[PDB]
């Protein structure tokens, strides 16, 4: 059924605040990861989505939150409602 997997982190602001210990040297800044529906696990570079509860880590230089989101967590209703199913389909088709 649909409702946030982490209702407490439904609001962006609440999600942002968890990145205070986020590894500064990373390309993915907190505001980015936050907007893409992610909150910080407090450990390493691991984050989880408030809606799908999916967690992504090992963030490489070439990674964009939304895209990574769409790629691995394709069934996430937050992405579909923000980016739309086309974006998802597109990201799912992209070569690299
Ligand atoms: Zn998600």
UniProtKB/Swiss-Prot annotation:
Name of the gene encoding the protein in the UniProt record: Diap1
Annotated function: Anti-apoptotic protein which functions as a caspase regulator, using its E3 ubiquitin-protein ligase activity to smother caspase activity. Binds, ubiquitinates and inactivates initiator caspase Dronc, and effector caspases Drice and Dcp-1. Acts as a Nedd8-E3 ubiquitin-protein ligase for Drice. Suppresses apoptosis by targeting the apoptosome for ubiquitination and inactivation. Plays an important role in cell motility. Overexpression suppresses rpr and hid-dependent cell death in the eye.
Family assignment from sequence similarity: Belongs to the IAP family.
Organism: Drosophila melanogaster
Cystine connections: none
Binding locations of Zn(2+): 49, 52, 69, 76
Positions annotated as BIR repeat: 12-79
Protein name: Death-associated inhibitor of apoptosis 1
Post-translational modifications reported in the UniProt record: Ubiquitinated and degraded by HtrA2 in apoptotic cells; proteolytic cleavage at specific sites in the BIR domain linker region generating inactive fragments. Mutation of one site reduces but does not abolish cleavage as another site is selected by the protease.
Classification lineage: Eukaryota, Metazoa, Ecdysozoa, Arthropoda, Hexapoda
Lineage top rank: taxon: Eukaryota
Quaternary structure annotation from Swiss-Prot or TrEMBL: Interacts (via BIR 2 domain) with Dronc (via residues 114-125). Rpr, hid and grim can outcompete Dronc for binding Diap1 therefore removing Diap1-mediated ubiquitination. Interacts (via BIR 2 domain) with HtrA2; this displaces any bound Dronc. Interacts with Strica. The N-terminally cleaved form interacts with Ubr3 (via UBR-type zinc finger); the interaction promotes the recruitment and uniquitination of substrate capases such as Dronc.
